């Protein structure tokens, strides 16, 4: 999974403060970071189906978090999906 | 029984040959926890340490050599 340094940096970046680890923004950011990292793993271990089940789970929960955000306030949703390069 | 809990060791060294020899028979096979009274966690640690020691030729696999 993600290293402590990566998560700390992502929380500090997308969060409100240092300990804003619960906001939808930081959750989506952590999920997309781990997904982008796991792409390299699955590029070569293409028949590791259990890890791929975990990856699909995190993709799905990122999708529903993004949907909740888009339903809450579309401005922050668009700003996020453009800061991460998603929903395209 | 449960000697390792009294020791409190986090892990069992495969380098502790003196200790490991008390958990293998003359045949050289591991002794079940059913008779040594070893906790299951420490029995797993024993199995792993003994297999590692066998690899490094610190303990014999069988008695036939």
């Amino acid at each position: 999974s993600l290293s402590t340094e990566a998560t700390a940096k992502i929380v500090s970046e997308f969060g409100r403060d240092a300990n804003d680890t619960g906001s939808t923004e930081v959750q989506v950011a952590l999920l997309t970071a781990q997904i982008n990292h796991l792409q390299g793993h699955f590029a070569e271990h293409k028949k590791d189906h259990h890890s791929r089940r975990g990856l699909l789970r995190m993709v799905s929960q990122r999708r529903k978090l993004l949907d909740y955000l888009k339903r809450k306030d579309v401005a922050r949703y668009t700003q996020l999906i453009e800061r991460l390069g998603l929903r395209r | 029984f449960c000697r390792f809990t009294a020791e409190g060791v986090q892990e069992i060294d495969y380098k502790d040959i003196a200790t490991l020899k008390n958990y293998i028979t003359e045949s050289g096979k591991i002794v079940p926890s059913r008779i040594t009274g070893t906790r299951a966690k420490y029995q797993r640690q024993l199995a792993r340490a003994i297999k590692r020691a066998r690899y490094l030729s610190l303990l014999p696999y069988t008695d036939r050599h």
Partner: protein, 106 residues
Amino acid sequence: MRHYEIVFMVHPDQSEQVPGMIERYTAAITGAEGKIHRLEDWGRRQLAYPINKLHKAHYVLMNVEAPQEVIDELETTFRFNDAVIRSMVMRTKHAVTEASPMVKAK
């Protein structure tokens, strides 16, 4: 940058060749910004079973904290060197700076 326990045996006929290899490997792992927390030369010991029709191999232990790259080329050298008959690289969550039971008897 993980901790490794590296234990390897040397052909007894190259027993005095050992300190050279020892210091060479320590220099390699330290020049790679990797510390060394322990180094014990158990020396010649009698095997529990033959290895290539042989006994009396030279055991030596090391405890390192290093990146994975230096560790993998180190085990590569282990493979392609023939004075070493059998090596073993394991991981450790912490750093061990103590006395191995093969030196407390000494």
